[PDB]
């Protein structure tokens, strides 16, 4: 059972004894979604972790590749041994029509396309070592998808499954903490100490190749790790009662990073992952469940009130319990920066060994790992909508904290709207000046460093203090919490540089105030269209068109782009303008003014100049010297292996392009068309009967969105790439 | 005596339109 289609599915009028093409993207454009399904949870809870399923079975279906296509054709071994010079590679490609050169031949006895995004650095991190090995983990995870995808069939199918004990929400919110983080954090420590720590500490010089202490060892009998960082390993662990001090040895807050190749200490990662490990094991019991220990579920929240902000933040929802949509913004804005947090974090202060020096992933990664984040949040609260126009039922609220906003609309939104001039309008309206003041504007006097200076300065800030922080003040840890901040206490390694005191100033309270801007007029778009969305002060009654819903009146003299669905249809564009900015600022700091090389007489030598400082003030400086000063990489870059990035943003510029045709265009104009041609088929009897109508409005504010928004990405990943590697 | 014709430019840009956006301020209240 059951099933199967055939016409008709969920958009009530789907079958319609057809009549027209353009159903094949009403279905492709409903299909998952609900209410154009039902909130009748006893068949919607039993979809969401159905799921939620595959995505993993897909993620598995994923990862089970990225080792088979690691460990079926290494650069891993044929390099590992030697970090430094000779670097990444996970795909080599069949000899069709001139594929070949696409698999380079530049990796240590290996033909193949070079690889950006750790992995080598992720698996020289644990240890593993041997292709026949995480190939012995390619199979570990592929059926291992199977059973998890054998859960679709587990419940639901032969088992219409349970909302009764889905709705509740206490065991799970306790157990994730404990339960299935806590199987983790520390039960990666047993791994991160015994497996990981020393097959690294003893990697950290000798141990070149093949005799590689297959993890097999170091259980039941110690002696060796014992022969290494001691601990006295009899059959009696001190710190059972406070000999803690001893079984330490190899985990005092070391901070800085491994100067015998960057990363930063694994001697500095069990103390991090058994503390933040168990908070999440203990603190993952604080709520009800059965055995009388716990807290309010919500009974906590209405705990407290405040006069204005009244009731307080009270009686916190009951679909927040129930289902998704209501909830569904928060697990995203959150998860949101929880991919901008780990970002501005990773590069920011290196994990797995071989980053700091690297590039083509102390950048690369950095991004995507900021797309997904931007993407994610900058489309998280299109879930605040739906919801109101959807999953929100009759009542639960008034005097709720909620409503306290919906009243106080118009004059909450509003007072952002102005910042969103000042902050920007004039703070971007500010490179502009120094263009009108470098072209027209004679260094004589204007906004750059030896200019609208700002002498010492800008500080430092703090950071710096971040550099008196370990020598006292938070007593120790070691070496200045992250070299990036501090004073001049300066390292690197691998000839080229690693991280250093990356000093800010003008060029720094500039730019910034743009991310500082943007993420203003990129929210409120958002908030304007998140608040009004269902009640809009100017079609006042929305829940009368749906979630998407095009516009409405040619009347009231120009009502369009009203929907949040379409408040989201440009909710994005900017993100792209904002995530697909910010990346940028990054990749001309890391580089030009962070990456290095080495020579010697006191002199680090960057990929490009300490340019930047005063040739990325002026708006322009980013085409003078951020394009045609770069791109050279990709511009020429054919007959080679940059031979894809000379091949992508091509058909990435077109397909930034072939957006506007559907996005600047009309819609009636097009339908109006698909007759004309029609005469050819018909009169000459061919013609459909799925009357070939021309793509539905929303549907084409559902392409010049994707397409624009596929377009100027790859492009910049067709681009930013090939810069890095040879002048990389 | 001599030096100019600037006479014109502080007009054509400075007062003239200062008087355009002045008297048709308008068109409305022309």
């Amino acid at each position: 059972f059951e099933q199967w289609a055939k016409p008709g599915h969920f958009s009530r009028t789907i079958a319609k004894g057809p009549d027209t093409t353009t159903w094949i993207w009403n279905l492709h454009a409903d299909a998952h979604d609900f209410d154009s399904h039902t909130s009748d949870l006893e068949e919607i809870s039993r979809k969401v972790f159905s799921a939620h399923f595959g995505q993993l079975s897909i993620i598995f279906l994923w990862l089970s590749g990225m080792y088979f296509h690691g460990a079926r054709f290494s650069n891993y071994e044929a390099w590992l041994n030697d970090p430094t010079h000779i670097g990444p590679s996970a795909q080599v490609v069949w000899p069709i029509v001139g594929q070949e050169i696409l698999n380079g031949d530049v990796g240590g006895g290996f033909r193949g396309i070079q690889i950006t995004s750790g992995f080598f650095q992720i698996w020289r991190a644990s240890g593993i070592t041997s292709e026949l090995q995480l190939y012995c983990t390619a199979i570990g995870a592929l059926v291992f998808a199977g059973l998890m995808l054998f859960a679709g069939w587990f419940h639901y199918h032969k088992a219409a499954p349970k909302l009764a004990w889905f709705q509740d929400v206490e065991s799970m919110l306790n157990h994730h903490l404990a339960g299935l983080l806590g199987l983790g954090s520390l039960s990666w420590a047993g791994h991160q100490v015994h497996v990981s720590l020393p097959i690294n500490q003893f990697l950290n010089a000798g141990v070149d190749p093949k005799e590689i202490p297959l993890p097999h060892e170091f259980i039941l009998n110690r002696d060796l790790l014992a022969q290494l960082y001691p601990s006295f390993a009899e059959g009696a662990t001190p710190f059972f009662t406070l000999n803690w001090s001893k079984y330490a040895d190899f985990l005092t807050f070391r901070g800085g990073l491994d100067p015998l190749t960057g990363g930063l200490w694994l001697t500095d990662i069990a103390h991090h992952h058994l503390a933040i490990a168990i908070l999440f094991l203990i603190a993952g019991h604080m709520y009800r469940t059965n055995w009388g220990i716990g807290h309010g579920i919500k009974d906590i929240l209405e705990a407290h009130k405040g006069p204005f902000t009244g009731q307080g933040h009270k009686g916190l929802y009951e679909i927040l319990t129930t289902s998704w949509h209501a909830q569904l913004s928060i697990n995203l804005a959150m998860l949101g920066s929880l991919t901008i947090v780990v970002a501005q974090h990773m590069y920011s202060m290196p994990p797995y060994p071989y980053l700091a020096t690297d590039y083509a992933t102390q950048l690369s990664l950095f991004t995507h790992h900021m797309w997904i984040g931007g993407f994610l949040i900058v489309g998280a609260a299109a879930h605040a909508a739906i919801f109101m126009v959807r999953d929100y039922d009759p009542t639960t609220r008034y005097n709720d904290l909620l409503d306290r906003v919906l009243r106080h609309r118009d004059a909450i939104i509003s007072h952002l709207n102005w910042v969103c001039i000042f902050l920007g309008f004039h703070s971007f309206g500010l490179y502009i000046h120094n263009d009108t003041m470098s072209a027209l504007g004679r260094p004589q006097d204007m906004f750059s460093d030896t200019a609208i200076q700002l002498q010492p300065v800008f500080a430092q800030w703090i950071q710096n203090t971040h550099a008196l922080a370990p020598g006292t003040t938070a007593p120790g840890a070691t070496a200045s919490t992250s070299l990036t901040w501090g004073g001049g206490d300066l390292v690197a390694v691998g000839n080229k540089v690693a991280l250093l005191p990356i000093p800010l100033g003008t060029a720094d309270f500039l730019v910034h105030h743009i991310h500082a801007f943007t993420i203003h007029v990129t929210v409120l778009i958002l908030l304007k269209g998140v608040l009004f969305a269902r009640s809009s002060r100017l079609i006042p009654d929305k829940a009368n068109l749906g979630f998407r819903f095009p516009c409405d009146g040619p009347g009231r003299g120009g009502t369009c782009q009203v929907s949040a669905w379409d408040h989201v249809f440009l909710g994005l564009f900017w993100m792209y303008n904002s995530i697909s900015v910010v990346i940028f600022h990054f990749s001309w700091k890391m580089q030009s003014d962070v990456w290095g090389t080495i020579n010697d007489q006191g002199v680090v030598t960057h990929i490009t100049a300490g340019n930047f400082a005063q040739s990325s003030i002026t708006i322009n400086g980013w085409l003078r010297d951020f394009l045609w000063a770069q791109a050279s990489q990709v511009i020429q870059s054919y007959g080679s292996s940059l031979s894809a990035y000379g091949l992508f943003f091509l058909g990435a510029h077109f397909v930034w392009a072939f957006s506007l045709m559907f996005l600047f265009s009309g819609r009636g104009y097009w339908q109006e068309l698909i007759e004309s041609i029609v005469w050819a088929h018909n009169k000459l009897k061919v013609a459909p009967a799925t009357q070939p109508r021309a793509l539905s409005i929303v549907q084409g504010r559902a392409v010049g969105v994707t397409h624009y928004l596929l377009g100027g990405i790859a492009t910049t990943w067709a681009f930013f790439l090939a810069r890095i590697i040879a002048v990389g | 005596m001599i030096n100019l014709p600037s006479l014109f430019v502080p007009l054509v840009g400075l007062l003239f339109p200062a008087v355009a956006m002045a008297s048709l301020f308008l068109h409305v209240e022309k």
Partner: protein
Amino acid sequence: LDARGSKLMPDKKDFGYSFPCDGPGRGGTCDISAWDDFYLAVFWMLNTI
């Protein structure tokens, strides 16, 4: 040409040349001026230049 009338709205004849789009009208209408076909026309021509 057919922007003489069409059959979508077989009466733009009345309507004219320069009517601003249409609104949701039976999901199957929009930017529809014979003007806003000159609009589009002036796109592809500056393309063809």
